[PDB]
RNA sequence: AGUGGGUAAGAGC
């Protein structure tokens, strides 16, 4: 049947409403990592151990 | 205090506007390409074409009857002894990286790394240690002669 | 914390409700050579986001 | 794809003669590219560094096609044709990608640049739906080259 | 590239035929040339690192043959390892130490 | 209507009580089965 | 097997050496084959030939 | 730690304990104090400093938040015209406020939150409170306090300013925030705990521990492009040292049978090229792909190992038709560029 | 045996790339039946792989010995 | 600013469902 | 409205 719902616009406006990545990361420890930018980064769901 | 409202950095909006600008540029390029691409009797008569083919065949039968160097090297002048010659190769750089194509010798790199390690072992503007470390002698070529 | 998309470290919960973001939570700070500057999220003069 | 192949067969030096192929068309093979943006950047760099490499244009266009941006693929192929008029593979890819009339005009431009190759002539004959148009393009081909058996064998169906 | 060439031929008997590149040697002669070349590499690494050949261990010699190096411009990461948490002192130029 | 092409009828919709009960039960079993469970798993189940 | 193991326990028998073949070479003597590969090849081939010749001499004595 | 916990969050307690293990807060204070000592010792004559002393403090002074004591003391040569106390970013200073011969310096570290991370206001408030505090012990009434928010990496100085101190302290503190060993350790531990990385993925990377795994009956191809674009340089005692380009050789060596393939490139290729490096990279990738296409399927390689890291991108581009051919980078430098010697 | 078991239970390249999630760049959820499942960098832009990550056949699913006997 | 989720019964009836979506 | 659900364990002086 295909995908009957799109959350792209909802998540777009949810990021927009929260002030964007800059404000959201201000709420976090991101600036405490001294990462020059938020672009070339990735997460890791589980640790090696 | 009183702040100033900054522009919101929205990655979704960035991707969407990038796609929209790409689509607009593609449409403009398509229009410009069609501007050039849109400028291009015997077509139906078989006997006329046969006669023309025969006449072209007989017509063909009747007719038959170094100064290019201006780059730089990652070494000092005194690093090269006068009485010896060496081979200078390119330095491994990423293809997407757009730095200057420096020229390098492997043996001298090994020697420089060894002497750097020896100097570091022996050691053990303002605020030099955090500048010269966390923040490469070279000379440029001219017509193949330096 | 809840309504941040999971890539930005949040939980990415979908909200079928009415949740207001206090204006005091839409301000961030950035340090440049001249000093530390402060930014709000929106020029709009409306209720809390 | 490539254009240079090398055959494999009391000395130390064993040279291999270069072999060229008239066509080099790998199928679409979609889904093999993981990083679309990185691959696009690398192929753009190849196009900049080796503008006269038809496989570069072909690969970039097919990557754009499998991505879904079927207009930038057409633009890239047109740029390649304006840059590599000698290789007919780019023109054949252009005919494959562009719609009917646009691809017919591209094949005509190929004939202008390369009136000796016959694959573009056969492709144009396939595009031209009119029997009169098929006759016209085939007779233009034979005027440019009348000693091709693989093209003359279509004259019996041309009547 | 100079002493290595000398080690390649231990005697004038070993002749490199034009058919191939490296000289043809007996198995034991190959062993001796290999150990001599290993000694060459270790001695030259010691020359550029002021380290004795015997100072290197088996794994270290393997690493050197492969091409491993050790360097540390910022060793202060040693900080990973009454109390001596502030007693460390600073020496100034105006002071006799500096 | 497919003939008059007029607004002959008005259809008012509502979520059935059984569906609401099922949704509440699903949320309840999501929550009560969360003693040892990551927050992301709970949020993903709720989102689904 | 228990007899051999307890003989090794009491020191009457040296501890068994790993059985090395060509494939097993870089796994058993990997850290040392880079020191002098030809000597390592000679040693492992000597061990393989020793096992093979022990088998052959056992067969011949049994003949 | 100097971190204040509002309500016990056992997970956050464990995380912050692990981040600041091995007395990291004290070591960060030590590193910052000594960096300031060195930066002042460098500029000891231009600032009319007689000498600089690293004031002794308690082992747990870094945690002393209720009270504070001087950490760095500056001795004036003859006299210092201490100005009115002001924030670090306040360039304007009323220089002639009080003369003195000492300039104490206090260093504070805090773990800021969302609502409380404005380090300028925090620095000013702490300076005023500590100066007016009876429990706080300081040598002179003239000094400066520098506050660092590690949670947001925000540094600011408030207090008195002897002449020429503001620009030097601004540059020095910008440098220390940009680079600092203790701060680098803090960042690394935080990154490890949060488990995010700055785009350094793990790919097949041939090292000295998997070197033994190379020695298998599979088909392996060592591709090298070090000797593609090269010149010969010789130094003339009479004139100038000069160069001359020579031909290049791409190595497609095969350890299984020793079949070493040389791609010999004449110097005429680099005639009208303004970027020789990436052109050589793409030429090498093209030749490698062509060679694999030439060989039959049975003899085609399955692992391509490159000594240089520059071939990781181009080869994957030109090997886009061969997905079962994994490409391995090599951290260890196999001396294959010397085979042309 | 230890080598074989380590190969069987070890982390594969595609599995290693699966649990890497790109920061900032949001991805649309391609699994309607469950929003909690994503491929991470696998198939996502910026994954650092120009080519597609192949399947480690050492992790192939196969039946037990007794199941083979019964079959 | 409490952080609690408010019920949108009797709320935002000036908006449809097809709005804010392309 | 509200108390809590917020004790680091350890070594002898």
Nucleotide with the nearest C1' to H4 CA: K6
Strand B4-5, strand C35-40: pairing: parallel
Q: How was this structure determined?
A: cryo-EM
Phi, psi of B54 (to 5 degrees): -65, -40
Give the separation between CA I29 and CA I45, rounded to whole angstroms. 15
Whether the CB of B88 is below 8 Å from some CB of chain H: the reply is yes
Number of CB atoms found within 10 A of residue E98's CB: 10
Give the separation between CA E66 and CA H332, rounded to whole angstroms. 6
The DSSP H or E segment spanning H265 is: strand H262-265
Largest CA distance in chain I: 52
Give the separation between CA A29 and CA H154, rounded to whole angstroms. 13
The residue lying closest to nucleotide K6, measuring its CA against C1', is H8
From the number of C-beta atoms within 10 Å of its C-beta (0-12, 13-18, 19+), residue H225 rates as: buried
Give the separation between CA H259 and CA H282, rounded to whole angstroms. 23
Is the C-beta atom of H272 closer than 7 angstroms to strand K? no
H168 contact partners, CB below 8 Å, separation of at least 6: B126, H39, H43, H47
Resolution (angstroms) stands at: 3.7
Separation between the CA of H129 and the C1’ of K12 (whole angstroms): 40
Question: The tokens of H122 are what?
Answer: 């925090």
| Cross-chain Cβ contact F47/C13 below 8 Å | yes
Give the separation between CA D138 and CA D104, rounded to whole angstroms. 13
Give the separation between CA B22 and CA B26, rounded to whole angstroms. 6
Largest CA distance in chain F: 61
- The residue of B106, B126, B138 whose CB has the most chain H CBs within 10 angstroms, and thus the best one to mutate to test that interface, is B126
Of the candidates D3, D7, D49, the beta carbon closest to that of H278 is on D49
Give the separation between CA C41 and CA B3, rounded to whole angstroms. 10
- The residue of J3, J15, J18, J20 whose CB has the most chain A CBs within 10 angstroms, and thus the best one to mutate to test that interface, is J20
Nearest to I6 by CA among I65, I58, I47: I58
Q: Look at the block and give the residue holding tokens 């233009």.
A: D140
H138 and H70 in contact (C-beta within 8 Å)? yes
Nearest to E65 by CA among C49, F29, G31: G31
Question: The tokens of H193 are what?
Answer: 């705990």
Q: What is the dihedral of CA H321, H324, H329, H334, to 10 degrees?
A: -100
Q: What is the DSSP string of E20-41?
A: SSSPP--HHHHHHHHHHHHHHH
Phi, psi of J5 (to 5 degrees): -85, 125
DSSP state of C18: B
Strand ranges in chain I using DSSP code E only, listed in sequence order: 20-22
| Cross-chain Cβ contact C24/H115 below 8 Å | yes
B104 and H229 in contact (C-beta within 8 Å)? no
A16 and B13 in contact (C-beta within 8 Å)? yes
Give the separation between CA C24 and CA H35, rounded to whole angstroms. 37
Give the separation between CA E68 and CA D44, rounded to whole angstroms. 36
B4 and C39 in contact (C-beta within 8 Å)? yes
Q: Look at the block and give the residue holding tokens 């005091």.
A: C24
Strand B85-90, strand H248-253: pairing: unpaired
From the number of C-beta atoms within 10 Å of its C-beta (0-12, 13-18, 19+), residue H168 rates as: middle
Nearest to H131 by CA among H76, H191, H68: H68
Give the separation between CA C16 and CA C7, rounded to whole angstroms. 21
DSSP state of H115: S
Phi, psi of H250 (to 5 degrees): -90, 130
Whether the CB of I23 is below 8 Å from some CB of chain H: the reply is yes
**Cα angle value B118/B120/B122 (rounded, 5°):** 70
Give the separation between CA H306 and CA H328, rounded to whole angstroms. 7
Is the C-beta atom of H178 closer than 7 angstroms to strand K? no
Give the separation between CA E44 and CA E36, rounded to whole angstroms. 12
Q: Look at the block and give the residue holding tokens 């990997």.
A: G30
H89 and H174 in contact (C-beta within 8 Å)? no
CA distances (Å), A36 to each of C28, H198, H276, in order?
17, 9, 31
Residues in E whose CB is inside 8 Å of some CB of G read: 27, 30-31, 34-35, 38, 58-59, 61-62, 65-66
CA distances (Å), E11 to each of E18, E34, H132, in order?
18, 15, 89
Give the separation between CA H162 and CA H178, rounded to whole angstroms. 25
H111 and H119 in contact (C-beta within 8 Å)? no
I65 and A43 in contact (C-beta within 8 Å)? no
Nearest to B79 by CA among B53, B101, B109: B109
What is the sign, positive or negative, of the torsion defined by CA atoms of E40, E41, E42, E47?
Answer: positive
Question: The tokens of C40 are what?
Answer: 């709000």
Separation between the CA of H8 and the C1’ of K7 (whole angstroms): 12
Separation between the CA of F5 and the C1’ of K5 (whole angstroms): 66
User: Do at least 3 CB pairs under 8 Å connect J with F?
Assistant: no
Is the C-beta atom of H332 closer than 7 angstroms to strand K? no
I28 and A46 in contact (C-beta within 8 Å)? no
**Chains touching F, CB cut-off 8 Å, 3+ pairs:** C, I
From the number of C-beta atoms within 10 Å of its C-beta (0-12, 13-18, 19+), residue B59 rates as: exposed
């Amino acid at each position: 049947d295909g995908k009957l719902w799109n959350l792209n616009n909802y998540r777009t406006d949810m990021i927009q409403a929260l002030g964007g990545v800059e404000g959201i990361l201000e709420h976090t420890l991101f600036k405490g990592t001294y990462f020059p930018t938020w672009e070339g980064l990735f997460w890791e769901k589980a640790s090696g151990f | 205090e009183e702040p100033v409202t900054a522009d919101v950095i929205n990655p979704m909006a960035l991707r969407q506007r990038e796609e929209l600008r790409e689509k607009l540029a593609a449409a403009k390029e398509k229009r410009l390409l069609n501007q050039k691409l849109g400028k291009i009797p015997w077509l139906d008569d078989t006997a006329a074409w046969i006669e023309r083919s025969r006449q072209l065949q007989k017509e063909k039968d009747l007719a038959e009857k170094r100064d290019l160097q201006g780059l730089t090297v990652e070494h000092a002048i005194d690093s090269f002894r006068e009485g010896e010659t060496m081979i200078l190769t390119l330095k491994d750089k990423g293809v997407l990286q757009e730095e200057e194509d420096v020229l390098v010798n492997v043996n001298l790199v090994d020697k420089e790394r060894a002497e750097k390690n020896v100097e570091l072992r022996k050691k053990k503007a303002q605020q030099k240690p955090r500048s010269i470390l966390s923040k490469p002698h070279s000379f440029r070529l001219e017509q193949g002669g330096t | 914390v809840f309504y941040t998309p999971k890539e930005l470290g949040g939980l990415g919960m979908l909200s079928m409700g009415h949740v207001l973001i206090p204006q005091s939570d839409l301000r961030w700070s950035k340090q440049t050579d001249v000093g530390i500057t402060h930014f709000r999220s929106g020029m709009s003069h409306e209720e809390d986001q | 794809t490539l254009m240079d192949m090398r055959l494999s067969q009391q000395t130390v030096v064993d040279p291999k003669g270069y072999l060229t192929d008239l066509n080099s068309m790998i199928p679409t093979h979609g889904g093999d590219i993981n990083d679309i943006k990185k691959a696009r950047l690398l192929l753009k760099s190849v196009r900049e560094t080796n503008p006269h490499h038809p496989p570069a244009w072909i690969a970039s266009a097919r990557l754009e096609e499998v991505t879904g941006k079927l207009q930038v693929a057409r633009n890239l192929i047109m740029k390649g044709t304006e840059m590599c008029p000698k290789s007919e593979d780019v023109w054949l890819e252009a005919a494959r990608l562009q719609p009917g009339d646009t691809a017919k005009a591209v094949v005509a431009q190929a004939v202008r640049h390369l009136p000796q190759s016959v694959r573009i002539y056969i492709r144009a004959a396939e595009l031209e739906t009119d029997i009169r148009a098929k006759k016209r393009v085939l007779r233009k081909a034979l005027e440019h080259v009348p000693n091709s058996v693989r093209l003359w064998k279509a004259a019996v169906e041309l009547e | 590239n100079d002493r290595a060439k000398v080690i390649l031929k231990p005697d004038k008997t070993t002749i490199t035929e034009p058919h191939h590149i490296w000289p043809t040697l007996t198995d034991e002669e190959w062993i001796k040339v290999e150990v001599q070349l290993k000694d060459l590499i270790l001695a030259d690494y010691g020359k550029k690192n002021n380290v004795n050949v015997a100072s290197l261990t088996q794994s270290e010699i393997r690493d050197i043959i492969l091409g491993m190096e050790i360097s540390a411009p910022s060793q202060q990461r040693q900080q990973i390892a009454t109390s001596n948490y502030e007693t460390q002192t600073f020496s100034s130029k105006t002071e006799w130490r500096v | 209507n497919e003939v008059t092409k007029e607004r002959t009828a008005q259809c008012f919709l509502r979520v059935d009580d059984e569906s609401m009960q099922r949704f509440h039960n699903r949320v309840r079993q999501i929550l009560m089965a969360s003693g040892s469970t990551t927050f992301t798993k709970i949020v993903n189940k709720w989102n689904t | 097997q228990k007899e051999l193991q307890e003989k090794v326990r009491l020191g009457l028998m040296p501890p068994p050496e790993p059985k090395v073949r060509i494939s097993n070479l870089m796994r058993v003597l990997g850290t040392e084959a880079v020191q002098d590969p030809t000597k390592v090849e000679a040693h492992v081939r000597a061990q393989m030939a020793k096992r093979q010749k022990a088998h052959e001499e056992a067969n011949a004595a049994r003949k | 730690t100097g971190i204040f916990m509002h309500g016990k969050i056992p997970t956050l307690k464990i995380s912050l304990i692990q981040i600041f293990r091995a007395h990291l807060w004290q070591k960060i204070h030590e590193s910052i104090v000594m960096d300031l000592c060195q930066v002042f010792d460098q500029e000891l004559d231009a600032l009319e400093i007689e000498t600089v002393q690293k004031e002794t403090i308690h082992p747990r002074k870094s945690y002393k938040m209720n009270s504070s004591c001087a950490d760095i003391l500056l001795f004036a040569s003859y006299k210092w015209n201490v100005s009115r106390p002001s924030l670090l970013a306040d360039s304007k200073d009323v220089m002639d406020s009080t003369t003195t011969q000492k300039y104490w310096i206090d260093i504070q570290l805090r773990w800021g939150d969302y609502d409380s991370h404005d380090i300028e206001r925090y620095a000013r408030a702490k300076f005023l409170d500590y100066t007016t505090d009876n429990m706080s012990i300081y040598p002179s009434p003239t000094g400066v306090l520098i506050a660092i928010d590690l949670a947001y990496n925000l540094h600011s100085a408030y207090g008195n300013w002897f002449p020429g101190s503001k620009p030097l302290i601004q540059q020095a503190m910008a440098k220390i925030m940009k680079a600092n060993p203790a701060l680098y350790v803090l960042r690394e531990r935080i990154r490890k705990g949060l488990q995010l990385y700055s785009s350094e993925p793990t790919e097949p990377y041939l090292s000295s521990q998997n070197y033994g795994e190379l020695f298998s009956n599979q088909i392996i191809w060592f591709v090298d492009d070090t000797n593609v674009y090269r010149v010969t340089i010789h130094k003339t005692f009479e004139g100038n040292l000069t160069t001359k380009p020579i031909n290049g050789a791409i190595f497609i060596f095969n350890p299984r049978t020793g079949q070493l393939f040389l791609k010999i490139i004449h110097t005429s290729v680099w005639a009208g090229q303004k970027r020789l490096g990436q052109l050589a990279k793409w030429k090498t990738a093209e030749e490698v792909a062509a060679l694999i296409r030439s060989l039959p399927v049975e003899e085609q390689p399955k692992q391509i190992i490159v000594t240089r890291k520059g071939m990781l991108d181009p080869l994957e581009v030109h090997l886009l038709d061969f997905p079962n051919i994994v490409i391995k980078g090599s951290e260890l430098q196999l001396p294959f560029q010397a085979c042309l010697k | 045996r230890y080598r074989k078991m380590k190969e069987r239970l070890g982390l594969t390249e595609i599995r290693k790339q699966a649990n890497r999630m790109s920061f900032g760049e949001i991805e649309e959820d391609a699994y309607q039946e469950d929003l909690g499942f994503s491929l991470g960098h696998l198939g996502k832009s910026g994954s650092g792989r120009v080519r597609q990550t192949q399947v480690n056949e050492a992790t192939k699913a196969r039946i037990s010995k007794t199941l083979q006997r019964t079959l | 600013p409490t952080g609690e989720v408010l019920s949108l019964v009797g709320k935002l009836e000036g908006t449809r469902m097809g709005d804010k979506a392309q």
